[PDB]
Amino acid sequence: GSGLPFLVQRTVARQITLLECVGKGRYGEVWRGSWQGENVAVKIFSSRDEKSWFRETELYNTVMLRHENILGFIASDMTSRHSSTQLWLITHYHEMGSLYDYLQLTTLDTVSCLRIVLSIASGLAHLHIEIFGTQGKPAIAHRDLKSKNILVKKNGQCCIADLGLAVMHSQSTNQLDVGNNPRVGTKRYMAPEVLDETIQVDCFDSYKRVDIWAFGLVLWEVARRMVSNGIVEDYKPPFYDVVPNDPSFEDMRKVVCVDQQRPNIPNRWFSDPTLTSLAKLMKECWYQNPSARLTALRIKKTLTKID
Numbered sequence: 001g002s003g004l005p006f007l008v009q010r011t012v013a014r015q016i017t018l019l020e021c022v023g024k025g026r027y028g029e030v031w032r033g034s035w036q037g038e039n040v041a042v043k044i045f046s047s048r049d050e051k052s053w054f055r056e057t058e059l060y061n062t063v064m065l066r067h068e069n070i071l072g073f074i075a076s077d078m079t080s081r082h083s084s085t086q087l088w089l090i091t092h093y094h095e096m097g098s099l100y101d102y103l104q105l106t107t108l109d110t111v112s113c114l115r116i117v118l119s120i121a122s123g124l125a126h127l128h129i130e131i132f133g134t135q136g137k138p139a140i141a142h143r144d145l146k147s148k149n150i151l152v153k154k155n156g157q158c159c160i161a162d163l164g165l166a167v168m169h170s171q172s173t174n175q176l177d178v179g180n181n182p183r184v185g186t187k188r189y190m191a192p193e194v195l196d197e198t199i200q201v202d203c204f205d206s207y208k209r210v211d212i213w214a215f216g217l218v219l220w221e222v223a224r225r226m227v228s229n230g231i232v233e234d235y236k237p238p239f240y241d242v243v244p245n246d247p248s249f250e251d252m253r254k255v256v257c258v259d260q261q262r263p264n265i266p267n268r269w270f271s272d273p274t275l276t277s278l279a280k281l282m283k284e285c286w287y288q289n290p291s292a293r294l295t296a297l298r299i300k301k302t303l304t305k306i307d
């Protein structure tokens, strides 16, 4: 799999001491833990999200996902702490936390902006691409790509996190996991075909194109925080101005499906070559027609050529 030898994995949870709680939400809790005096991140899942714990555990153990831009899996366990049975996912610890939180604390220059977005595109392309052979991997669509599910490294690269909603496709196999409704992710980031439920649930490539829509929104979030001529925008989530907090499906449908609105491009971006290029790139992620959207590899290539 992606983590420790497995026999090691079961013993890891018992060797971990939880030191600080660094995150808490409806998903559960995230802690900085220590394993042999080395930091690890321990996500303790709420009962609401227990199935996400199981699906992510299945995945990381059935596919050996190892990539610098994917959160590094260490182990998963159903363990007991303080006499309560708990669902733990243990990964590499990234002190900087989520991109969402990071963008609200500092601003970016051209180098650090491009490093962030390129690393996300590289991670997403690695998820998306199916690799044949005994040491390959199925294609993976994330289905909840957003800034809260991206972690920042000290070196300024990022890695994609939270595969609990991901769907896998082997070009050999048939059927896509999917199941239930297609509207499983974060409403604010949902593509038009999800919101209006016209997505072809049987076509795996539909899910990759949904990730690309969300990636375009993440690019917009990040680009706002890149300084140009001492100018920068405050952090805002996508569509902050046109929809309420915790927006409903109907809110999103009118903006994105009926009006076909997209996040607004700050005028000052067209005073800077990099931001001008990023604006064009994100618009090619937001086509109403999913098949017109760029692929993750095309985005990666374009970003590598920008400087």
Ligand SMILES: CNC(=O)[C@H]1C[C@H](n2c(-c3cc(OC)c(OC)c(OC)c3)nc3ccc(C(=O)NCCCN(C)C)cc32)C1
Binding pocket: 022, 023, 024, 025, 030, 041, 042, 043, 071, 089, 090, 091, 093, 094, 095, 096, 097, 098, 101, 102, 105, 148, 149, 150, 151, 161, 162, 163
């Ligand atoms: C998920 N929601 C949240 O709000 C946050 C993000 C999540 N976090 C993870 C993490 C872990 C996962 O598995 C273990 C996981 O699932 C695979 C996952 O999914 C997205 C994320 N490592 C983290 C390491 C540090 C921090 C942190 O905040 N501060 C430290 C100082 C930085 N400060 C100024 C912003 C948060 C971490 C808690």
